[PDB]
Swiss-Prot record, chain A:
Mutagenesis / variant outcome for changing residue 179 to H: Confers resistance to atevirdine, efavirenz, loviride and zidovudine
Whole-protein coverage range: 592 to 1018 of 1435
Impact after mutating residue 92 to P: Confers resistance to TMC125
Motif Tryptophan repeat motif: chain residues: 372-388
Residues reported in the UniProt entry to bind Mg(2+) 1: 101, 176-177
Outcome of substituting residue 63 to E: Confers multi-NRTI resistance
Impact noted for substituting residue 70 to V: Confers resistance to abacavir, didanosine, HBY 097 and zalcitabine
Protein name: p51 RT
Consequence of changing residue 148 to S: Confers resistance to lamivudine
Organism the protein comes from: Human immunodeficiency virus type 1 group M subtype B (isolate HXB2) (HIV-1)
Domain Reverse transcriptase, chain residue ranges per copy: 40-208
């Protein structure tokens, strides 16, 4: 077809990211996958006169024992000019949502000749016994931000009928996926979904539950009798927490803590301390007022490892003004390895951010870069790749959220 | 032998123009020569004369190559190279000996001056212009890849991969590996068969103007592979020669420690501690240094190690990969990867500069990881591990550590010393243990501090510190507490760094003081550490805390 010209934000130059080593197993899969798309004329071999590169790798979704090829266009998306695609607020509320992989669509559409160079990628060779194997895209690539863009038109068309005939159903598209939300009981939803697939096929468990993601309150322990320690632990938490709710007060409790007593020593509460506490439990019964999403600012996701397979997180834009927070328990089977648990976690959270703000959060990961670089891909299963940084969990922010109900 | 191959489009960096440097003046014999030589490749069609419509120029030189009292030429493309675009990767990393599968036989074809067999982009040719002056004050340009110009290797590599796609296809049971101007081909055919094919290949390159040295004049095993000696059924560590000498200069020692360090990889046992000591204070790279006797015995013991040559084996895909690790000292590990016991594929060692605060398990963890990576880079796969640590130990540590961590399928090997947890903080206060409320404060500007404690048993201490800092004070508070406590202790502190230790429970640190505490932690039977907000009323933080602030 006639191709739309895509360009780089002014001043920028193509991506020159190095390829990460790949296992034999997945290098094989990529070759197969590529020789094929080559024949199919989707991609073409390139020379060294081209100096750009983007990392590539392979993964397999659940219920799919067929390798799938994934590219890391983050860098390129960062450098690709913007254009404007609309996000609802309805699926946020839907009783259920279903995600759909429509990445395929793109491979029908051609990509502007001059932007192709920028899409160069490389299949490496085990032990470097051979030189790498350079390709470049000729059609819209999956995982690129321009693709859902350029394929906008056609897309809307293809859908309008299902749209118009079902305005009680929400459809949001975020890159390679399509989010479908309806309150219709499962029967109708599932069936109506499959009907939608067909609607698409025609042109060429698993369910989500939006609502139910309610932020949890911070519950405080209760004892029959308290010890010096217990209090100190409690007071420590409250003190820090006051940075969120400034109505929290700790003096009456801190008063009992005057005197050099043993940690195990038991202490009875003064009626004043009793109140101060009861008053605190109240304030904590609800999220801090005044926190409103700001579309113009980056969404941030912090994760703390809690051990025992547990993890806690908080999405926010300004420290202490969380938009959302939550707990996550390890998927059945990851009983021995952290990295697996974390990626799964990362994916679930990114998902919610999408559904909610239609935007991927920037992650702050409690793991050493090297560890993460070496194995995240092994367990990755989403077409998109969020942004991340590696950090050191302050001990306090951890004890706090451990207290979530 | 120019070739009939598609030239690769080449262009100058974003908005720059070709070279324009003056040509040096030359002797009668440095001009005579270059005239001859150039008239040579001129006739060979390699270079073509140019007129005045070319404003560029590169300085041509003339140096009589050693072991031939005949003259040779050299062109200086420094500038041109600065102006030429960049290419992708002329070397994605070197194939390591251990990543090769054995072969019944391996030839190597020097595709030598094939650099000049590949025609250069007609358009670009104009920037390659250079000048042959005359006695008292002749122009040319290249029509083929010039020796020493940025894109040659790259252009020549890809050129090569193309020209090889066909022959490779037909003969898949064959194996070519390329690198530079050296083409390595191996296989598992019978020598006569191998022989035939090599010749077959040869006449293939031979078809694209690509002249190759015949069987009568090519190289033969062993092959010196940068560091290794290569036989098709085994490789060797080409013995290293330590120059025995009279007087030593600083510089010499460095170079020596350099080669020694390189060696420690294959030869663990090698040491350089005392030898390194010889540099402390060194005023000049050439000042001579007296070799301490300790340095003698060491330098000596190292020659003995480097005596025994070391041969290894190749990769056999039909066998599993094993990686075994050993801890040689604190933050020092040795590892050997093999398929059949004692038949080593690769070995190495690591030194971990303690850094902020670590612990052996964490460090063990990082080793695995590093190994895992290079394994993949070589065998496109990762080894099963034999680790000097108990599953119990590992389990206790990781399920609790604050950071995400993991170790691929591994198995405990009882090869002492094992890595263990030197101490573990109590999860809750110890009943029937003294309780030390510690606190430390220091004047930031004057660096004057006090550290101290008071217990629930009525015991107390305090100490004045000169030339100290806050963190130190705080820590010190804690050190004292530990010193004066006994086997079971409870310690409350308002320190931010105490929070550190708690969450990490490090068994090594850069800070001597920390180490001090760590040593003391290890001595204790049961220790429980607690943190409380500073400057709040929390008694303890009010009494020992009150005694140390003014
Ligand atoms: C230096 C080098 C780099 C990569 N591969 C090889 C070689 N050279 C060899 O001599 C060699 C030795 C054993 C197995 N393959 C070998 N060859 C293979 C190509 C025939």
């Amino acid at each position: 077809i006639e191709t739309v010209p895509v360009k780089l934000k002014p001043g920028m130059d193509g991506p020159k990211v190095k390829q990460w080593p790949l296992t034999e197993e997945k290098i094989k899969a990529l070759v197969e996958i590529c020789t094929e798309m080559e024949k199919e004329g989707k991609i073409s071999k390139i020379g060294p006169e081209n100096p750009y590169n983007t990392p590539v790798f392979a993964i397999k979704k659940k219920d799919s024992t067929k390798w799938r090829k994934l590219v890391d266009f983050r860098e390129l998306n960062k450098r690709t000019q913007d254009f404007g695609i609309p996000h609802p607020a309805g699926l946020k509320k839907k009783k259920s949502v279903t995600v759909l992989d429509v990445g395929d669509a793109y491979f029908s559409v051609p990509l502007d000749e001059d932007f192709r160079k920028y899409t160069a990628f490389t299949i490496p060779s085990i032990n470097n016994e051979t030189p790498g194997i350079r390709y470049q895209y000729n059609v819209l690539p999956q995982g690129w931000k321009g693709s859902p863009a350029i394929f906008q038109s056609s897309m809307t068309k293809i859908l309008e009928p299902f749209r118009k005939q079902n305005p009680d159903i929400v459809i949001c598209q975020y890159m390679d996926d399509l989010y479908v939300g309806s309150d219709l009981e499962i029967g109708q939803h599932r069936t109506k979904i499959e009907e939608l697939r067909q609607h698409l096929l025609r042109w060429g468990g698993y369910e989500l539950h939006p609502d139910k993601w309610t932020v949890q309150p911070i519950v405080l322990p209760e004892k029959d009798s308290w010890t010096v320690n217990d209090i100190q632990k409690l007071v420590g938490k409250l003190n820090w927490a006051s940075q969120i709710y400034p109505g929290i007060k700790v003096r009456q409790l801190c008063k009992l803590l005057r005197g050099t007593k043993a940690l195990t020593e038991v202490i009875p509460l003064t009626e004043e301390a009793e109140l101060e506490l009861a008053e605190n439990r109240e304030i904590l019964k609800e999220p801090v007022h005044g926190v409103y999403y700001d579309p113009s600012k980056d969404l941030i996701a912090e994760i703390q490892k809690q051990g025992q397979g547990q993890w806690t997180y908080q999405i926010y834009q300004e420290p202490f003004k969380n938009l959302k927070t939550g707990k996550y328990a390890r998927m059945r089977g990851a009983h021995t390895n952290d990295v697996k648990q974390l990626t799964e976690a990362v994916q679930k959270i990114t998902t919610e951010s999408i559904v909610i703000w239609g935007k991927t959060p920037k992650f702050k990961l409690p793991i050493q870069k090297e560890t993460w670089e070496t194995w995240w891909t092994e367990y990755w299963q989403a077409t998109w790749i969020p942004e991340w940084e590696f950090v050191n969990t302050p001990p306090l922010v951890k004890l706090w959220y451990q207290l979530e109900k | 032998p120019i070739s009939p191959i598609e030239t690769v489009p080449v262009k100058l960096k974003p908005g720059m123009d070709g070279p324009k440097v003056k040509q040096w003046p030359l002797t009668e014999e440095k001009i005579k020569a270059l005239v001859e030589i150039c008239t040579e490749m001129e006739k060979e069609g390699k270079i073509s004369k140019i007129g005045p419509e070319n404003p560029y120029n590169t300085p041509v030189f003339a140096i009589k190559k050693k072991d031939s009292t005949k003259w040779r030429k050299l062109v200086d493309f420094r500038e041109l190279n600065k102006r030429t675009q960049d290419f992708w990767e002329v070397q994605l990393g070197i194939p390591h000996p251990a990543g090769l599968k054995k072969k019944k036989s391996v030839t190597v074809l020097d595709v030598g001056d094939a650099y000049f067999s590949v025609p250069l982009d007609e358009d670009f040719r104009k920037y390659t212009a250079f000048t042959i002056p005359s006695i008292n004050n002749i122009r040319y340009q290249y029509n083929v890849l010039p020796q020493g110009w940025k894109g040659s290797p790259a252009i020549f590599q890809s050129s090569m991969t193309k020209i090889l796609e066909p022959f490779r296809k037909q003969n898949p049971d064959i194996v070519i590996c390329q690198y530079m101007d050296d083409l390595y081909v191996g296989s598992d055919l019978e020598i006569g068969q191998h022989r035939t094919k090599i010749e077959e290949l040869r006449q293939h390159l031979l078809r694209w103007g690509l002249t190759t040295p015949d069987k009568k004049h090519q190289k033969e095993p062993p092959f010196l592979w940068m560091g290794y000696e290569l036989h098709p059924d085994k490789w060797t560590v080409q013995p290293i020669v330590l120059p025995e000498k009279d007087s030593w200069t600083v510089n010499d020692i460095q170079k020596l420690v350099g080669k020694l360090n390189w060696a420690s990889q294959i030869y663990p046992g090698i040491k350089v501690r005392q030898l390194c000591k010889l540099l402390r204070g060194t005023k000049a790279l050439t000042e001579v240094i007296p070799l301490t006797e300790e340095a003698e015995l060491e330098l000596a013991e190292n020659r003995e190690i480097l005596k025994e040559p070391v041969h290894g084996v190749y990769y056999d895909p039909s066998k599993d990969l094993i990686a075994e690790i050993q801890k040689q000292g604190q933050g020092q590990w040795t590892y050997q990867i093999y398929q059949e016991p004692f038949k080593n594929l690769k070995t190495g060692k690591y030194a971990r500069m303690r850094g902020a605060h670590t612990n052996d398990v964490k460090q063990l963890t990082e080793a695995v990881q590093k190994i895992t990576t290079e394994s993949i880079v070589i065998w496109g796969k990762t080894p099963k591990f034999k680790l000097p640590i108990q599953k119990e130990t590992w389990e206790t540590w990781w399920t609790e550590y604050w950071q995400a961590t993991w170790i691929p399928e591994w198995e405990f090997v009882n090869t002492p010393p094992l890595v263990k947890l030197w101490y573990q903080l109590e999860k809750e206060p110890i009943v029937g243990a003294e309780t030390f409320y510690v606190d430390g404060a220091a004047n930031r500007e004057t660096k004057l501090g006090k550290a101290g404690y008071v217990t629930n048993r009525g015991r107390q201490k305090v100490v004045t510190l000169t030339d100290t800092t806050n963190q130190k004070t705080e820590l010190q508070a804690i050190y004292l507490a530990l010193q004066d406590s006994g086997l079971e202790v409870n310690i409350v502190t308002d320190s931010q760094y105490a929070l550190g230790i708690i969450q990490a429970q490090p068994d090594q640190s850069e800070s001597e003081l920390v180490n001090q505490i760590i040593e003391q932690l290890i001595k204790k039977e049961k220790v429980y550490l607690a943190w409380v907000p500073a400057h709040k009323g929390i008694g303890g933080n009010e009494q020992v805390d009150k005694l140390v602030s003014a």
